[PDB]
Design an enzyme around this catalytic site. Sequence first.
Site, short mmCIF file in Angstrom:
data_model
loop_
_atom_site.label_atom_id
_atom_site.label_comp_id
_atom_site.label_asym_id
_atom_site.label_seq_id
_atom_site.Cartn_x
_atom_site.Cartn_y
_atom_site.Cartn_z
N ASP A 35 0.72 -1.16 -0.08
CA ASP A 35 -0.14 0.11 0.04
C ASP A 35 1.00 1.22 -0.21
OD1 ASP A 35 -1.81 1.63 0.29
OD2 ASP A 35 -2.25 1.45 2.27
N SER A 199 -0.66 15.58 -12.07
CA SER A 199 -0.68 15.09 -13.62
C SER A 199 -0.91 16.37 -14.26
CB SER A 199 -1.84 14.31 -13.59
OG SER A 199 -2.38 14.01 -14.74
N1 LIG Z 1 -6.20 1.82 1.22
C1 LIG Z 1 -5.75 1.20 2.52
C2 LIG Z 1 -6.99 0.36 3.03
O1 LIG Z 1 -6.98 -0.85 2.14
C3 LIG Z 1 -8.06 -1.86 2.19
C4 LIG Z 1 -7.71 -2.88 1.63
C5 LIG Z 1 -8.89 -4.14 1.82
C6 LIG Z 1 -9.63 -3.64 2.69
C7 LIG Z 1 -10.10 -2.51 3.36
C8 LIG Z 1 -9.06 -1.50 3.17
#
Ligand SMILES: NCCOc1ccccc1
Length: 330
Positions: A35, A199
């Site tokens: 992430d 962008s």
């Molecule tokens: N973008 C951060 C959080 O990402 C998720 C990933 C899966 C389920 C819920 C949240």
Amino acid sequence: STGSATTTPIDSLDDAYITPVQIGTPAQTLNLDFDTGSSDLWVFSSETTASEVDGQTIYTPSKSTTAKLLSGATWSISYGDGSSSSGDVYTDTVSVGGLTVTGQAVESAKKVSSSFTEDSTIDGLLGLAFSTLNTVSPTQQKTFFDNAKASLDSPVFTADLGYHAPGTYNFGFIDTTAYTGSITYTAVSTKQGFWEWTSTGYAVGSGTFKSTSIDGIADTGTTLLYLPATVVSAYWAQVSGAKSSSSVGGYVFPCSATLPSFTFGVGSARIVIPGDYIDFGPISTGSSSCFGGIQSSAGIGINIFGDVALKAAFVVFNGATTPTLGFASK
Ligand SMILES: NCCOc1ccccc1
């Protein structure tokens, strides 16, 4: 040093991608969601409330000879979608694709929200935004990339996400066989802790390119592309029957439609997202209304170049002293 790991979509829609990560000694392999929009490495664990675990693989620190409790440290995170998790912290050895970090903070979940419980394929998250966003208290912790950076051949990682197919995360090198043409680099602001860039504009389908600055973040942990309402309206206006649905929570379109592509600018270069990448399928099983992959950022406070956009490119996260982002077609 370098590392290289394959990342795999969790489902037929590319809702997220999971990458195997080795934690502890002997290794415990967990499939984590890398992430670039957050900065905590957290896992389902032997400490996670039992009723909140439903099929995930857990990290058990008591079975790792290299795990050490980080005494007094706790963490608690709330993501933009309303999901959350919290717990305590161990340090342990973490390896990704052959690249090893000793003493990495591994945040053990005691509690997770329902969206995590329901995703049996995601065993945790591995944050790759800037360490200033890490939530560990009272001593903030570094990301896996931050800890690895000095050892890497080059202080970079790359995201090469697949469309309905596996892709690759590389650490410490740029695979010049993985993209076409040249990589265009663009400036990053770290002021909000994100890989935030601007962008240079967009086009819808075969339409003319609109030069306009769009500040947003490169976020592998967000599924969709979230852009200003003006841009999103211009896109969906080209799809017969598409509309914004308050009851569904965004733009929907007839599943019988053929979607136009969407182009975004990176400096003078252009990345083309094919129309099929924007189809997220029926809103509910059997429906002929399909969910769009480009949605308004109006309620979010930031534009998000999520997986829909990033999977159309080979993306360089350059963690040199002045960070930058690079994009190439592929
Ligand atoms: N973008 C951060 C959080 O990402 C998720 C990933 C899966 C389920 C819920 C949240």
